[PDB]
Design a protein around this ligand. Structure first.
Ligand SMILES: CCCN(C)Cc1nc([C@]2(O)CN[C@@H](c3nc(-c4ccc(C(F)(F)F)cc4)no3)C2)cs1
Length: 330
């Protein structure tokens, strides 16, 4: 089997991407944030504290003939920005883009933190990291991809995110029309539960390439590109007036600037992030200080190839027995 679904930016900055997901019978369609950096499929629901729901579409398990309470199971998760959610668990039929998993764990939120409430466009998350990170207790649950994998034509999914435009998540096949050149595959470590890999280095703008190993994760659920402070300083040093602001929370730059591109290495291949992809716009409406799309990972504990990097590429998440990641230009 295969599936294919369109993913759409939630706003004009590409702060996140949402993908429609059918849950239950009859289908209830919720727009979920597909997150290759976590492993829980959770939704706003009829159980979510009413004051914490503000415009999201909710899953109502009592209206689904295929829903069953997963008795005694609970979940609780926090994300890298400090947000969090928790609740209980149902199993139900979940379909993405025509690909169906029966008995998928659907984690129903009882509580969500303020950043979730405030984002009316995100009805929940669909985790695509390794199932070892799933938070359901006392019986850990599998991700949608892990549940689908044995049925897929090939044990893969691909992320083809757009820049200020829709893109595609495919399951079970590689669309050879969706990229240019070849896909370069690189080894993955699953030791921390992520799609963790080692980039071979970087270049700023037209500069020569610096060969250096950069361990990090491929994370569609993170907006920006978080890299070591050395690399990030070398980038922003090329932008007149750019500086790290402790009050804003990262590098800012004059909105009058045109940004250089940023290249990262995948083996002997290169992915070029155009400078415009690094512009996240005014820090507040009307400001002439703009927020940078490349930020330091210092203090996160891990480098993150988030959407700024991934949307420059066609990315293969290969979940074969020995997992790997593939990157192609597009
Ligand atoms: C080894 C150190 C781990 N430490 C915690 C850094 C890391 N963090 C992650 C993520 O938690 C997973 N992938 C990101 C992700 N964030 C979201 C998200 C968050 C908030 C919203 C909201 F604003 F609406 F609330 C929407 C989506 N979705 O995915 C970050 C992987 S490593």
């Amino acid at each position: 089997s295969t599936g294919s679904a369109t993913t759409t930016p939630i706003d004009s900055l590409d702060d996140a991407y949402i993908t429609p997901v059918q849950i239950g019978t009859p289908a209830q369609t919720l727009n979920l944030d597909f997150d290759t950096g976590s492993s829980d499929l959770w939704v706003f629901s009829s159980e979510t504290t009413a004051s914490e729901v503000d415009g999201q579409t909710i899953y109502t398990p009592s209206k689904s003939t295929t829903a069953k309470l997963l008795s005694g199971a609970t979940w609780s998760i926090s994300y890298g920005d400090g947000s969090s959610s928790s609740g209980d668990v149902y199993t139900d039929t979940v379909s993405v883009g025509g690909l169906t998993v029966t008995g998928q764990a659907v984690e129903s939120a009882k509580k969500v933190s303020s950043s979730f409430t405030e984002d009316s466009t995100i009805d929940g998350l669909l985790g695509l990291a390794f199932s070892t990170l799933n938070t359901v207790s006392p019986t850990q649950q599998k991700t949608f991809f892990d549940n689908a994998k044995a049925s897929l034509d090939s044990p893969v999914f691909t992320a083809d995110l757009g820049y200020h435009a829709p893109g595609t998540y495919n399951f079970g096949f590689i669309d050879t029309t969706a990229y240019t050149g070849s896909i370069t595959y690189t080894a993955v470590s699953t030791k921390q539960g992520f799609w963790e890999w080692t980039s071979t280095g970087y270049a700023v703008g037209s500069g020569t390439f610096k060969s250096t190993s950069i361990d990090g994760i491929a994370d569609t659920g993170t907006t920006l590109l978080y890299l070591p402070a050395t690399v990030v300083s070398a980038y922003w040093a090329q932008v007149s007036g750019a500086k790290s602001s402790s009050s804003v929370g990262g590098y800012v730059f004059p909105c009058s600037a045109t940004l250089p591109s940023f290249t990262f290495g995948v083996g002997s291949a290169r992915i070029v992030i155009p400078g415009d992809y690094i512009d996240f716009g005014p820090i507040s409406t009307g400001s002439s200080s703009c927020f940078g799309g490349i930020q330091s990972s210092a203090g996160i504990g891990i480098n993150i190839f988030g959407d700024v990097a991934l949307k420059a590429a066609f990315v293969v998440f290969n979940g074969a027995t020995t997992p790997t990641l593939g990157f192609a230009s597009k």
